Amino acid sequence: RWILGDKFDTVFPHKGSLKVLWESRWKFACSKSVYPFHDGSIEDFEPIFNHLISKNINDAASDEYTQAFLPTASALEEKAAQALQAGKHEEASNLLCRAAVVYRISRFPYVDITKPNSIKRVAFERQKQAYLKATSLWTQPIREVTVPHTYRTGNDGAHIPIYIRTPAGADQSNPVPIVLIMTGLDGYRPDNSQRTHEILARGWAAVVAEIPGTADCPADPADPASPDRLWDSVLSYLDQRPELNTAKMVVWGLSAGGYYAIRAAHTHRDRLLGAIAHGPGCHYYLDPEWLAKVNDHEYPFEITAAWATKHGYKTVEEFVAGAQKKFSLVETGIVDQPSCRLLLLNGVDDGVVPIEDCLVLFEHGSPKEGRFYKGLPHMGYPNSLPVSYEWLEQVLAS
Ligand SMILES: Oc1cc(O)c2ccccc2c1
């Protein structure tokens, strides 16, 4: 049935084994300081994972996993405190960024938005504090703005915390283009350092916002229209900001954020020059046959429990039964209207969201843009990253 083919019916070897996950993927990813260990150091993680493997802790959702990371984070914060006092601001920033990655992995894969007393929420709260302190020392610092949700209705929260970073020379006389990052299930606003570096290096502003049913997003996760109101608030705030040119704006949806990039490309087409959807779902990812096997593929841990809560469902059974008809951009007809330019990027052999969720968008609305990587899993890294920046350079060209 699925383009994924033989791999669909496979149980991936790291399933329920943090040992195999580490030894076969995460150890290498950590060494290279690439996702999910970007900004991070193997010297910080190897002792923690050796501890987790020795105690045979495989459930990332459990407190035993989360709390294994916190003493390392503490020691890094003290090393940073020492570095700062000695006037070593670059070292202190790096140590705090390293602490942020330790907190990030500790709260993998999902901070439960309904359980604010959870250790993973506490980990995320400490990560944000570490990260803001680290980035306050940058020549172009990341600044948090709490955007009032003026377009809030129903069960929407009041406040939209976003990260903004502006390149050197950005002012009312010379306002700069905007790349608006929409983050994912396991990546929130502090998890995008290198993306902000690249955006600023091309003379653009970086704005980072979390998606409904994650992190500090106030959008009603149960209301499919909640993202539309969320972006009405964010885009209205950016319109007012004198140094940011909203006439040259692109949205960048990462993984779970890809759904929201695709949706926004239709709902807000007249306010966007373009949208990138990186490893997106929009329809077939909520197919019960797909959700039956999604836990058996490349995602480091169980995903269906996190997905249930992120889609505003109290139970996984209720999620599998109801999600597609409610949230599908195809089923609901969101795709049957025009869109701004939309670049779809993924691995052909994505076992997290199906490649069919890129391909189906070519059978609706405006012409779409795509590059899909043969034999590559979810996100189609590393190939899919540099093409992202090539496309932004074209769309935002002077
Ligand atoms: O921002 C992201 C999010 C992901 O889920 C990724 C997965 C694999 C490789 C890079 C990623 C980057």
Numbering used by the authors: 3 to 400
Question: What do the authors of the reporting publication say about this deposited model?
Answer:
A common step during their assembly is polyketide trimming, which Afyg1p, Wdyg1p, and PlAntI catalyze. In summary, the N‐ and C‐domains in all three enzymes are oriented in a back‐to‐back fashion forming an interface that encloses the intramolecular binding cavity next to the active site. The catalytic triad is formed exclusively by the α/β‐hydrolase domain with the nucleophilic serine located in the consensus GXSXG esterase motif. The resulting Ser‐His‐Asp network is perfectly aligned with distances in the range of 2.5–2.8 Å between the active‐site residues.
